[PDB]
Design an enzyme around this catalytic site. Structure first.
Site, mmCIF file in Angstrom:
data_model
loop_
_atom_site.group_PDB
_atom_site.id
_atom_site.type_symbol
_atom_site.label_atom_id
_atom_site.label_comp_id
_atom_site.label_asym_id
_atom_site.label_seq_id
_atom_site.Cartn_x
_atom_site.Cartn_y
_atom_site.Cartn_z
ATOM 1 N N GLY A 29 0.791 -1.232 0.000
ATOM 2 C CA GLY A 29 0.000 0.000 0.000
ATOM 3 C C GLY A 29 0.820 1.278 0.000
ATOM 4 O O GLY A 29 2.049 1.240 0.080
ATOM 5 N N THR A 30 0.129 2.413 -0.079
ATOM 6 C CA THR A 30 0.785 3.726 -0.107
ATOM 7 C C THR A 30 1.346 4.089 1.266
ATOM 8 O O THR A 30 0.953 3.515 2.279
ATOM 9 C CB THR A 30 -0.171 4.853 -0.564
ATOM 10 O OG1 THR A 30 -1.234 5.008 0.382
ATOM 11 C CG2 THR A 30 -0.751 4.556 -1.946
ATOM 12 N N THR A 31 2.263 5.050 1.288
ATOM 13 C CA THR A 31 2.927 5.453 2.525
ATOM 14 C C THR A 31 2.010 6.332 3.380
ATOM 15 O O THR A 31 1.339 7.229 2.867
ATOM 16 C CB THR A 31 4.245 6.209 2.241
ATOM 17 O OG1 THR A 31 5.038 5.468 1.302
ATOM 18 C CG2 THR A 31 5.047 6.411 3.524
ATOM 19 N N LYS A 61 -8.736 10.148 2.696
ATOM 20 C CA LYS A 61 -8.301 8.858 3.245
ATOM 21 C C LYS A 61 -8.169 8.860 4.770
ATOM 22 O O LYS A 61 -8.447 7.847 5.416
ATOM 23 C CB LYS A 61 -6.978 8.434 2.608
ATOM 24 C CG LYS A 61 -7.104 8.081 1.134
ATOM 25 C CD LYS A 61 -5.783 7.608 0.546
ATOM 26 C CE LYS A 61 -5.458 6.176 0.940
ATOM 27 N NZ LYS A 61 -4.227 5.687 0.258
ATOM 28 N N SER A 74 -2.542 2.155 5.842
ATOM 29 C CA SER A 74 -1.969 1.718 4.577
ATOM 30 C C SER A 74 -2.336 0.264 4.338
ATOM 31 O O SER A 74 -2.372 -0.530 5.279
ATOM 32 C CB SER A 74 -0.449 1.858 4.609
ATOM 33 O OG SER A 74 -0.070 3.207 4.816
#
Ligand SMILES: [Cl-]
Lengths: 243, 231, 241, 250, 244, 240, 235, 195, 111
Positions: A29-31, A61, A74
């Protein structure tokens, strides 16, 4: 073997491979990061702009729990939302019975016990998210990070996602260089920089920055999103540091 | 391989194969396009038939006077989810005398799809949805995927060969976004967008399906001779 | 071989899931120790904080179950906290139902019975933890009772748990052979903590700073954990003798 | 969530064997030796206290347990399984008998209730059999003294004398030579200690041996006086000192 | 999920057989032989105890023969624990019938209900069947003396003479040879013992390895008596027929 | 509760559990149904590996569901009792609410519905039983004969057989039974039923059961001697 | 084994796809829709000559204005018909009107996917639902176990479906009379049927606004069969 | 519902039951049969709360008929009466009890004896030579005490029954529109058409 | 003891012509001898050319109208935007009302 096919099964090592497999989804996933400061906490996250067609600022988010707790995560985004929905129910029932808003350590265990419960049976899947969260209570500021296993600890700084190691390294420098403490407004600027530095590990698609914060002085102990001038000020600070 | 027997199992690389197989059902589905300006939001859907003797499968469903979606994939799953949306829109009206926000509509769908991906016995939904609507913060377009992921967009497309329409909208972004106070022109842009996903077949009178919602326009669907204007 | 996945018997009469839960016990790589004084029961545990970003105050494997009972865990923290919350609830309910504070050994039995159920019922997995309960019971005096994933439990004169448990065990055995008694003949709890730390140093062969240890002390009518400065004060006394 | 294991984990194999019961019996075989001998005026049950560690207090762990004032129990196999059975056995004696008839159940019926619980773990959904064999000694007015064995299958058999666990084969042979129908209680205790020494390897004294009897009534252990009909428990656990006295004249 | 570990106890084989029922019958075939013989003036139940130990308490023991009510008894072959579950159910069912109709339960009705319970475990519930075969011996005023048998399949049939458990093939041949319709109880007693004596896997048939019971109208005038034989009574009847 | 889907589809579009239940029916003793002009006759095989039987008390193969309807079967005996019980209860329930006994078609439809429900219910296996249901509707003289099977399908038959070697006896009936002219009398119908069983049975002693059903709740079971007379008559005519 | 509600890698439900194979083994059923009415016809397919063919009920009434034909595991259709009949009558009770053919079909199709680990497996039967209402007129629907339904001008299901459907493609036009449609069902049935078509092994039915849903007698169908043979020999 | 009588004689049981069905100030029917045949040799008459009576009678009838089919055997009058009593004994502690009183007249074929059972709505069973429910008993019991003999014939029982009906018609306030009489004996159940 | 009903007064009137129909009602709302509102409408356009009024206990009247309006909405969803005929609406309302037969809506309804 076959020990990794079912959840809640111990391998001969004493490991739950299904939980370790859920961690791989988190690493994909994204940071996202969390920074504890003088009188509060700051949360930030990397939003990958897949297309021009994504509406800017309108795919939020970071999530609020109660009025004083912020949560970011994440990995599998839906799993994170499910966890926050539970968090809100836990926080509501606490306030209902005990009147006072839920303390952060108390809240941290409520999620911890819930996530841990999803490693006890083969009829459920572990959570595919590491959750960074925290806020301000009667005892001051708290920052936590919760993992698929149900493991959580208090943190000075926290990071998870594809650029966690880059972010962790940058977080460690802040802890060393600021032993007396970091201010809320400083932590927002630093948060931006660290996301931009952590974006080097996800640099195909360009990204959108999103920051939130709780502070006893700056936000009056409540969770708010960083927007407008204060956001653009933090972006400019980050842009100047990468160059 | 060994980790695709059910939704409750993670793969060694952290993938949910049953969710990915559900995503595959959408790719097999007929193309549908969504796009919006500031005043209106439009759904365009290519309907599919079994043969020349059959009818064309209806792709667009109304949820409220101000909201509705188009589907791609398992139609019965879209019926279940659209029915859930109808109830949530309706609950908001009866209890709070309040039109349901398109953003909350997405959040509710996300959470309903998620529960089916974490429990034994159940299965993921096998359908993708494009939700349009007009609420207190103007026009909206959402893309629902049965993994749970919901995304707000200016324009998009899902289904087979949806990449052609999605590229077109990515080029046309600056043009169609400013089509304000002009329904017919926004539809034209959507009809031209879906045309970039056509192969061998062209848009006929009982093939095309269009829907629109906006400032002074309730969610209405156009089929049959009512879409002959746009061919 | 599905007899190794759930808690059913293998051909040789074994529960492999229970055995593998025992191996999860040492996953944290932490050694604990418990001893009894005249008026008190002291428990000590290693504290390892590898990450610099961690808030060290929140890193703990010792729990205050009730006012009188304390519990140290050897095993992963999620299962540890799971056991801790349940024990707290059980101790609270006991007091409400029966009108007196739950004894250490009764709580140990109750948690052990719960652990037994997981070894017999299939849908529940065992917890990969070893629970060491300590108190100064109003009837039995200083008490140490330890639970494991098998559902086994027993009282102890003293005990140790962890990867290098055997080295600590024999170190304590050799002391009680010499002293000829069931406890540490000492008046104040402060010196019983000093004994505990000293014998852990000898057994493990490592030196400890204030942040390398975690200490819990049970006295009559209260159990409490020591701060870093309380331990530091204790380490100074050992060094000056 | 929820217990989805609503099906049997013990099933018949092609050869007709119930695997899990057989494997449970294998677990009992590995367990420490325990025995029971029936005399004319009493019953004795005994076992070795296998200590897990010398730091552990073996007094806190009781292998021989009181079920009713006139009934006692000992086991071989898995201790935790035994502990919860004793809890369930004590409760069922009250719920399914004493709360109905105002008196404690006779040995055979309490044994029957325990057997029922162990049988259900053999057939019910999502559970394994209990990994223990019990020896239940007891007395009641109309049946007198009696000794029963209970297996993981739920089967139970009455015995004049028997042994279960590690060295049961040799111990049973030893008891066949020594047992007669004219044995007094003290003679049975003596034979029990002789039989147990063969299986025990390390220390053999009152601290490593656990032994209880079902004999005469004990008014001193009752805790009150004033009711003539209430004369006290027939179950008595022999002390560490009482065992060592009999080990000198061995 | 849990699907992985399900044995599927209630399914058909490709040949149309119930796996678990067949395997339960295989289990029963190793159990001690039990014989039932129906005479014109009574019924005999004889059963062989499973390899007895000399230190087993014989007089205060019950393994094979159980009493359901004053008019009906059963001989067991298979898992004793399983049988006791079913016996207590049968005992309760008989008392329910008496409570409802103020009349002792007809033998077949009791047998059918107990057999219907066994059938249930083969068709639904996902549980293993009861590893038990019964021989029912009883009397009522409709059909008089009756012998039945039920097995794990839940199928029951009536008999004049029948064996269950071990060596039934050999035992049934011997019964078929020497049985006749005008037979008395005392003759049936002799047949039962002679059959066990030849089919036994033991060296010699003795009193301590047997359970015996009769259901006669040998009481005073038009009433049925159940006699569960004592050890000494079996010793005497064994000498009286010239086996020992 | 036990939920497992035991009856499920296979790649080739078959439900094996239902098809394996049919194999259990094929194993069962033969049963035959023949309907005449004013009657129906149900014939049933009884295997002769079982001597020392008590025929007084042994469950009969043909069962009365009501005073005017009967049910025979092939397959698992234990399973058949459950269907018969349910049918008998439904028969009384119909009389109670409709104030009229069941038609043979209705009773069949109910039993068939029960069998079908067990082919798509969780935790249960299909009935290893096929039934022949015969009788006369209330105030009606037209004979009725129906067949059911594990899948749940049911249909009416002029004559039909089920069980082991049923394909042999069906072959016999297919050429010997005339649609234009069915057995005019009771004797003719019974004889054709016995003849058809004699193609398969072995001996005509205590192996064949015959039950005759006539209009207005007139049902009777034939004894050994009565059946033996048909066996003796058929064999003498055969030697030609 | 594997879950009942499992997806294949191609994105289809295994059990639904397998139930479709069972339907291909079933007997042929054909439906044709016209402006004068809707015709439904089926192959009876008796397994043996002793079986009384008139007891084979593969065409069924749901209401006066809605009929139904089936193909596949026909036993599974009983509970579907029961539901349809109840739905139709219940709607009349709540709204004092006839229920739309589409709405009825949708109600039946809602049962389809109510299976898993609700019933244990999908239905192994496809339905042709024909009817009339005031709004959309004469209609023919094909209801599958996938929960999907298509409206059709003409449709064939069962073992001879793909061959019959190709024939219906050529023969169907928007100006077909009822009589023309009746013959067309018989013609196509006779082509795909194994045994020779007659009044005993094939059954016709129709639904008209005026007379409602009617199953034809064996005498009436026999004349239409004779009329069909004569017309084919006439050129 | 009001008058139900029963007389057991040497070789039969005779049940008499009033024909009137009254609601308010109107006699709605004057030819009502307040009885159901439970089995070929068992008959049950009933009286009590409207609706409950028939609903209960038919429910019992269905259960007994179900038993007869299952076992291919007729239950004894004693067995049927015990079953009926238990159902009423359950009923009385229900949310809404059956308010029905019954007489069960039957001929036991095994004993070759007639049997008459009187059961009230509470589940109170008694075997009697003669019985009655409601206000009828207050006249008929004392009358039968005097005139009844145990060895009477069926014809003598009918004359004894006529004597009861006459007394009721003379002294009862309500018009019950005569009675339907039925006889239960070794040959089964039959109705007397001219009474 | 709590009384769940109340009387909000007012009156309504419906007349039908050849090609039209009227449904009138006063706008006064009351409790006991007090006026709550001089203008509180209780005659509503429910869609599909159906007007409705449920006079009596206003809370029950509002609840009913609210439920019928919702019934019309779902009638469109479930039956392809078909127009709800007045006769069908009437029957639908009967079921709404009788659904609470044992805890009634204290209203006199006219459509
Ligand atoms: Cl407990």
């Amino acid at each position: 073997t076959g020990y990794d096919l079912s959840n809640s099964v111990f391998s001969p090592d004493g490991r739950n491979f299904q939980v370790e497999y859920a961690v791989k989804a988190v690493e994909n996933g994204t940071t996202s990061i969390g920074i504890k400061c003088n009188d509060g906490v700051v949360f930030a996250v990397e939003k990958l702009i897949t297309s021009k067609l994504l509406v800017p600022q309108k795919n939020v988010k970071i999530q609020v729990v109660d009025r004083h707790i912020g949560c970011v995560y994440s990995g599998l985004i839906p799993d994170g939302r499910h966890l926050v929905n539970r968090g809100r129910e836990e926080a509501a029932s606490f306030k209902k019975l005990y009147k006072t808003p839920i303390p952060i350590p108390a809240f941290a265990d409520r999620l911890g016990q819930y996530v841990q419960a999803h490693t006890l049976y083969n009829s459920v899947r572990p959570f595919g998210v590491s959750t960074i969260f925290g806020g301000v209570d009667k005892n001051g500021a708290h920052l936590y990070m919760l993992e698929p296993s149900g493991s959580y600890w208090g943190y000075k700084g926290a990071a998870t996602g594809k650029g966690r190691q880059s972010a962790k390294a940058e977080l460690e420098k802040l802890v060393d260089h600021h032993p007396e403490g970091l201010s809320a407004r400083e932590a927002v600027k630093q948060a931006a920089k660290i996301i931009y530095l952590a974006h080097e590990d996800n640099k195909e698609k360009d990204f959108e920055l999103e920051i939130s914060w709780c502070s006893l002085s700056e936000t009056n102990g409540l969770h708010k999103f960083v927007k407008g001038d204060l956001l653009q000020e933090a972006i400019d600070f980050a842009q100047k540091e990468i160059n | 391989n060994n980790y695709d027997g059910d939704t409750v199992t993670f793969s060694p690389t952290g993938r949910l194969f049953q969710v990915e197989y559900a995503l595959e059902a959408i790719k097999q589905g007929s193309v549908t396009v969504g796009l919006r300006s500031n005043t209106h939001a439009v759904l365009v859907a290519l309907k599919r038939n079994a043969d020349e003797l059959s009818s064309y499968q209806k792709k667009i469903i109304k949820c409220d006077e101000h909201m509705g979606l188009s589907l791609a994939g398992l139609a019965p799953d879209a019926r279940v989810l659209s029915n859930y949306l109808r109830q949530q829109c309706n609950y908001s009206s009866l209890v709070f005398n309040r039109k349901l926000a398109v953003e909350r509509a997405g959040h509710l769908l996300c959470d309903k799809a998620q529960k089916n991906t974490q429990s034994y016995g159940g299965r993921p939904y096998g359908v993708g949805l494009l939700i349009i609507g007009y609420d207190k913060s103007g026009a909206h377009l959402l893309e629902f995927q049965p993994s749970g992921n919901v995304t707000e967009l200016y324009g998009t497309a899902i289904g087979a060969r949806s990449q052609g329409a999605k590229t077109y909208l990515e080029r046309t972004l600056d043009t169609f976004i400013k089509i304000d106070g002009n329904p017919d022109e926004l539809i034209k842009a959507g009809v031209e967008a879906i045309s970039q996903s056509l192969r061998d077949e062209s848009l006929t009178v009982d093939n095309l399906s269009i829907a629109i919602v906006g400032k002074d326009t309730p969610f209405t669907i156009y089929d049959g001779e009512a879409v002959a204007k746009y061919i | 071989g599905y007899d190794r996945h759930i808690t059913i018997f293998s051909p040789e009469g074994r529960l492999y899931q229970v055995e593998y839960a025992f191996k999860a016990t040492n996953q944290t790589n932490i050694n604990s120790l418990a001893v009894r004084g005249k008026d008190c029961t002291v428990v000590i545990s290693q504290k390892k904080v590898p990450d610099k970003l961690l808030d060290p105050t929140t890193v703990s494997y010792i729990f205050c179950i009730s006012r009188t009972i304390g519990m140290v865990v050897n095993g992963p923290i999620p299962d540890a906290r799971n056991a801790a919350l349940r024990a707290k609830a059980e101790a609270a309910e006991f007091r409400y139902k029966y009108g007196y504070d739950m004894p250490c050994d009764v709580l140990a039995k109750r948690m052990a019975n719960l652990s037994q159920i997981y070894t017999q019922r299939a849908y529940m997995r065992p917890l990969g933890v070893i629970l060491t309960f300590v108190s100064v019971d109003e009837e039995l005096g200083p008490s140490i009772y330890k639970t494991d994933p098998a559902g086994y439990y027993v009282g102890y004169k003293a005990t140790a748990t962890g990867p290098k448990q055997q080295e600590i065990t024999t170190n304590l055995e050799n002391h009680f052979k010499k002293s000829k008694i069931d406890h540490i003949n000492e008046e104040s709890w402060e010196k019983v903590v000093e004994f505990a730390i000293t014998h852990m140093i000898d057994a493990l062969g490592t030196e400890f700073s204030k942040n390398d240890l975690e200490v819990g002390v049970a006295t009559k009518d209260k159990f409490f954990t020591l701060s870093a400065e309380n331990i530091e004060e204790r380490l100074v006394a050992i060094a000056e003798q | 969530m929820t217990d989805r294991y609503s099906f049997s984990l013990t099933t018949f194999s092609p050869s007709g064997k119930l695997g899990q019961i057989d494997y449970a019996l294998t677990a009992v075989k590995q367990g420490v030796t325990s025995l029971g001998i029936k005399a004319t005026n009493g019953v004795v049950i005994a076992t070795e206290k296998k200590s897990s560690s010398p730091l552990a207090m073996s007094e806190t762990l009781s292998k021989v347990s009181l079920l009713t004032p006139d009934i006692g129990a000992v086991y071989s196999g898995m201790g935790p399984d035994y502990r919860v059975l004793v809890d369930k056995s004590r409760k069922v004696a009250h719920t399914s008998y004493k709360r109905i008839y105002g008196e404690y159940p006779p040995t055979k019926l309490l044994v029957s209730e325990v057997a029922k619980i162990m049988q259900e773990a053999t057939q019910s959904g999502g559970v394994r059999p209990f990994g223990v064999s019990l020896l239940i000694a007891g007395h009641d007015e109309f049946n007198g003294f009696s000794l029963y064995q209970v297996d993981p299958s739920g089967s139970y058999f009455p015995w004049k004398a028997t042994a279960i666990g590690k060295g049961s084969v040799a111990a049973k042979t030893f008891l066949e030579k020594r047992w007669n129908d004219e044995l007094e209680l003290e003679d049975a205790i003596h034979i029990a200690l002789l039989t147990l020494k063969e299986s025990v390897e390390g220390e053999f004294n009152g601290d490593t041996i656990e032994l209880a009897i079902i004999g005469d009534e004990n008014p001193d252990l009752l805790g009150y006086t004033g009711i003539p009909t209430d004369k006290g428990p027939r179950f008595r656990k022999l002390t560490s000192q009482e065992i060592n006295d009999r080990l000198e004249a061995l | 999920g849990s699907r992985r570990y399900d044995s599927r106890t209630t399914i058909f084989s490709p040949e149309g057989r119930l796996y678990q029922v067949e395997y339960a019958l295989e289990s029963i075939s190793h159990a001690g032989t039990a014989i039932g013989i129906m005479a014109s003036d009574g019924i005999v139940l004889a059963a062989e105890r499973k390899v007895t130990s000399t230190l087993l308490e014989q007089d205060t023991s019950t393994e094979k023969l159980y009493k359901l009510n004053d008019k009906i008894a059963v001989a067991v072959a298979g898992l004793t624990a399983d049988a006791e579950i079913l016996i207590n159910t049968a005992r309760i069912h008989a008392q329910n019938y008496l409570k409802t109709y103020n009349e002792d339960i007809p033998v077949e009705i009791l047998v059918r209900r107990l057999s219907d319970i066994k059938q249930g475990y083969t068709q639904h519930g996902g549980l293993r069947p009861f590893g038990v075969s019964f021989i029912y011996a009883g009397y009522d005023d409709r059909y008089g003396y009756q012998l039945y048998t039920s097995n794990p399949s839940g199928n029951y049939t009536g008999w004049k003479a029948i064996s269950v458990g071990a060596n039934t093939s050999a035992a049934q041949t011997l019964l078929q040879m020497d049985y006749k319709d005008d037979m008395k109880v005392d003759d049936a007693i002799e047949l039962a013992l002679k059959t066990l004596s030849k089919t036994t896997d033991s060296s010699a048939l003795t009193y301590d390895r047997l359970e015996f019971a009769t259901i006669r109208k040998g009481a005073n005038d038009g009433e049925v008596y159940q006699k569960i034989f004592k050890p000494q009574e079996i010793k005497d009847i064994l000498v009286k027929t010239g086996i020992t | 509760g036990y939920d497992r889907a035991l009856s499920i589809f296979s790649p080739d579009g078959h439900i094996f559990q239902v098809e394996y239940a049919l194999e259990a029916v094929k194993r069962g003793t033969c049963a035959v149904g023949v309907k005449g002009k004013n009657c129906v006759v149900l014939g049933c095989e009884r295997r002769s590996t079982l001597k020392l039987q008590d025929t007084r008390i042994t469950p009969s193969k043909v069962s009365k569901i009501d005073s005017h309807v009967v049910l025979s079967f092939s397959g698992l005996n234990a399973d058949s009792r459950i269907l018969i019980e349910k049918a008998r209860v439904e028969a009384q329930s119909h009389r109670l609410t409709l104030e009229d006994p069941v038609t043979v078609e209705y009773l069949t439809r109910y039993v068939a519905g029960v069998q079908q429900r067990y082919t798509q219910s969780g935790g249960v296996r299909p009935f290893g039983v096929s039934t022949l249901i015969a009788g006369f509707d209330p105030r009606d003289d037209e004979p009725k004969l129906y067949q059911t099977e594990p899948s749940g399908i049911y249909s009416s038959w002029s004559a039909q057989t089920i069980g082991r070697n049923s394909k042999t006896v069906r072959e016999f009936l297919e050429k010997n039974y005339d649609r234009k002219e069915p057995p005019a009398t009771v004797e003719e119908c019974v004889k054709l039923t016995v003849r058809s069983l004699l193609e398969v049975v072995q001996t005509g002693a205590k192996n064949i059961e015959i039950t005759v059903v006539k209009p207005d709740s007139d049902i009777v079971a034939l004894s050994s001697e009565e059946i033996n007379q048909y066996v003796t008559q058929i064999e003498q005519e055969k030697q030609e | 084994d594997r879950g009942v509600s499992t997806f294949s890698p191609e994105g289809r439900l295994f059990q639904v796809e397998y139930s479709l194979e069972a339907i291909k083994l079933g007997s042929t059923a054909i439906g044709i829709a016209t402006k004068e009415g809707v015709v439904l016809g089926v192959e009876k397919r008796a397994t043996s000559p002793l079986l009384e063919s008139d007891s084979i009920e593969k065409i069924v009434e749901i209401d006066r204005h809605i009929g139904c034909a089936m193909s596949g595991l026909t036993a599974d259709a009983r509970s579907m018909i029961e539901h349809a009949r109840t739905a139709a009558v219940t709607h009349n009770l709540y709204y004092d009107e006839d229920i739309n053919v589409e709405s009825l079909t949708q109600s039946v199709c809602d049962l389809a996917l109510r299976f898993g680990e609700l019933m244990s497996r999908p239905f192994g039967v496809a339905l042709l639902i024909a009817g009339h209402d005031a709004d959309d007129g004469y209609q023919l629907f094909h209801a599958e176990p996938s929960g999907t339904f298509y409206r059709y001008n003409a449709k064939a299901i069962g073992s001879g479906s793909e061959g019959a459907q190709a024939e219906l493609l050529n023969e169907w036009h928007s100006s077909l009379t009822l009589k023309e449609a009746e013959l067309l069902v018989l013609k196509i049935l006779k082509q795909v049927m194994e045994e020779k078509l007659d009044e005993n092994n094939a059954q016709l039915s129709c639904i008209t606004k005026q007379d409602g849903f009617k199953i034809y007698d064996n005498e009436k169908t026999a004349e239409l069969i004779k009329e069909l043979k004569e017309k084919e020999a006439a050129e | 519902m009001d008058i139900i009588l029963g007389i057991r004689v040497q070789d039969s049981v005779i049940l008499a039951s009033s024909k009137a069905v009254t609601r308010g100030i109107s006699v709605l029917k004057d030819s009502d049969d307040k009885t159901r045949q439970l089995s070929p040799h068992t008959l049950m008459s009933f009286a009590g709360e409207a609706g409950d009576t028939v609903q209960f009678a038919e429910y019992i009838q269905a259960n007994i008929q179900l038993y007869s089919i299952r076992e291919d055997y007729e239950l004894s009058p004693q067995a049927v009466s015990s079953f009926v009593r238990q159902e009423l004994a359950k009923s009385i502690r229900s949310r809404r009890p059956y308010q029905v009183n019954v007489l069960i007249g039957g001929y036991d074929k095994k004993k070759n004896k007639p049997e008459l059972y009187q059961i009230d709505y509470l589940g109170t069973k008694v075997e009697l030579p003669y019985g009655a429910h409601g206000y009828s008993g207050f006249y008929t019991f004392s009358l039968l005490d005097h005139h009844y003999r145990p060895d009477m014939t069926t014809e003598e029982g009918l004359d004894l029954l006529k004597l009861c009906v006459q007394e009721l018609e003379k002294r009862m306030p309500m018009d019950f529109k005569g009675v339907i009489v039925k006889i239960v004996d070794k040959d089964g159940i039959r109705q007397v058409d001219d009474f | 003891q709590f009384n769940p009903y109340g009387d909000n007064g007012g009156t309504i009137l419906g007349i039908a012509g050849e090609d039209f129909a009227v449904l009138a009602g006063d706008t006064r709302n009351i409790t006991d001898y007090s006026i709550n509102s001089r203008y509180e409408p209780k005659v509503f356009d429910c869609g599909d050319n159906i007007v409705m009024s449920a006079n009596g206990f206003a809370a029950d009247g509002d609840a009913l109208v609210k439920r019928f309006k919702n019934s019309v909405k779902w009638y469109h969803f479930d039956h392809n935007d078909k127009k709800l005929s007045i006769n069908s609406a009437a029957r639908n309302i009967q079921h709404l009302l009788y659904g609470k037969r044992f805890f009634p809506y204290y209203v006199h309804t006219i459509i």
